[PDB]
Amino acid sequence: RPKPQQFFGLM
Amino acid sequence: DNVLPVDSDLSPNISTNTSEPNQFVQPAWQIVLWAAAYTVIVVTSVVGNVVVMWIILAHKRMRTVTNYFLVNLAFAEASMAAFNTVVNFTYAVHNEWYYGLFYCKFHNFFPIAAVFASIYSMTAVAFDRYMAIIHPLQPRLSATATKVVICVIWVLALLLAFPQGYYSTTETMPSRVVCMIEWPEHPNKIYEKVYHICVTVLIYFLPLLVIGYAYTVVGITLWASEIPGDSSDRYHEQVSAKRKVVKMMIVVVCTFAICWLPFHIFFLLPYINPDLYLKKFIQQVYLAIMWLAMSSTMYNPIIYCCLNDRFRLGFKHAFRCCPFISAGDYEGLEMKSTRYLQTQGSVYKVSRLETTISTVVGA
Numbered sequence: 001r002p003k004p005q006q007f008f009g010l011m
Numbered sequence: 012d013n014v015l016p017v018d019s020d021l022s023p024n025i026s027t028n029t030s031e032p033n034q035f036v037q038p039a040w041q042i043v044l045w046a047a048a049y050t051v052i053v054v055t056s057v058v059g060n061v062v063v064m065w066i067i068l069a070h071k072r073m074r075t076v077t078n079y080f081l082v083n084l085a086f087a088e089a090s091m092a093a094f095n096t097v098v099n100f101t102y103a104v105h106n107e108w109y110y111g112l113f114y115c116k117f118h119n120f121f122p123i124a125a126v127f128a129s130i131y132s133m134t135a136v137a138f139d140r141y142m143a144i145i146h147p148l149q150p151r152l153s154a155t156a157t158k159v160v161i162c163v164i165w166v167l168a169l170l171l172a173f174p175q176g177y178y179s180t181t182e183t184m185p186s187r188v189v190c191m192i193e194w195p196e197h198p199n200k201i202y203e204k205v206y207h208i209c210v211t212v213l214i215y216f217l218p219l220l221v222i223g224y225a226y227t228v229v230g231i232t233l234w235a236s237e238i239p240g241d242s243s244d245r246y247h248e249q250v251s252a253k254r255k256v257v258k259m260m261i262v263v264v265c266t267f268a269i270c271w272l273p274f275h276i277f278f279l280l281p282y283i284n285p286d287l288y289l290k291k292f293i294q295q296v297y298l299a300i301m302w303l304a305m306s307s308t309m310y311n312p313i314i315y316c317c318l319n320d321r322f323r324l325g326f327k328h329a330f331r332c333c334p335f336i337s338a339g340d341y342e343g344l345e346m347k348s349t350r351y352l353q354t355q356g357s358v359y360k361v362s363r364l365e366t367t368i369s370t371v372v373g374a
Contacts, residue, residue, distance in 0.1 A: 002015060003023075006030055011111035 013286045017185045017294045028183040032106030036186050036294045045302060046103035049096050052309060056092035059312025060085045062326060070325045072344060072351025077256060079157040080136050087125045088308040095122040102188025115183055116176060119190035124172035127214045131164045133264055134218045137225035140257050144232040149370060171214045180206045185297035194281045207282045215275050222264060233257055259318035263311060270307040274300040328352050
């Protein structure tokens with residue numbers, strides 16, 4: 001499952 | 012088997028191509044290997060394509076409609092060498108998309124446009140060959156039209172290339188840092204599935220068929236057999252000369268298909284069975300083919316040199332700053348008049364043939 005933290009800053 | 016990347020995230024190891032290196036996907040050295048391939052390619056692609064564009068513009072004699080189309084091809088290759096390869100290189104040594112999603116988009120769009128434009132341009136070339144063979148009547152044709160035609164191909168190319176930018180599909184390639192259309196998921200909001208079938212068939216496949224079809228018609232007419240001198244199965248030197256052009260065009264197409272076809276096939280197969288493995292669905296396979304497609308950019312300058320004496324001799328004229336074109340010259344129309352070049356051999360107002368001016372030249 002992808003980590004949600006990078007969701008905010010995908011870049 | 013799959014995560015957003017081609018590798019499974021059995022371990023938590025998988026990380027976004029945007030965020031981190033993808034070292035888990037393949038060996039680090041493999042990264043440098045792809046980077047190395049790209050660096051060498053940049054040199055060859057740039058030099059060869061520039062030479063083609065430079066030579067024809069430089070040499071007045073090489074002004075054929077076909078030459079116009081070839082510049083277009085050369086230009087498409089140049090963008091690859093300048094624009095796409097550079098980014099693909101940076102990534103490779105970085106091991107991922109440092110640039111981030113926006114750039115993935117920029118990087119996919121330009122490269123996609125380049126591929127579409129090439130196949131489409133090849134079709135125009137095929138049609139023009141067909142036209143030349145059946146109806147030698149020179150007047151039904153215009154240089155101005157050719158430019159218009161070239162622009163048109165770009166327009167259509169944009170029709171596929173641009174819509175992904177419009178809310179449509181998107182994404183990076185297996186190990187990748189090369190970006191392409193979203194074959195992996197059916198990102199619903201995105202409407203990926205529709206776009207995928209549409210693009211491959213309409214842009215790549217249909218044009219391939221037409222080129223193939225036009226090729227068949229040419230089969231009845233001028234064929235491979237061509238005697239070097241005008242005499243023998245050739246009705247006029249010009250007729251005998253043309254057969255040479257057609258053969259090169261054929262080879263250009265063949266090389267194109269070999270380079271691209273594997274990518275397009277893989278394009279579709281994962282569409283049908285995503286999240287699974289083809290023979291093996293992996294980083295390696297997708298990667299190999301897409302990078303291979305890149306190699307195409309280099310091949311055309313080589314084919315020209317081998318394939319046609321006219322370019323070969325004229326190019327050499329360019330390479331040595333002065334004429335110095337020993338080796339037997341074009342021994343035909345290096346230029347119609349004599350040698351051809353910007354200056355040097357290509358004399359102003361090259362000669363005209365017929366009482367009237369047959370070719371639109373010497374105008």
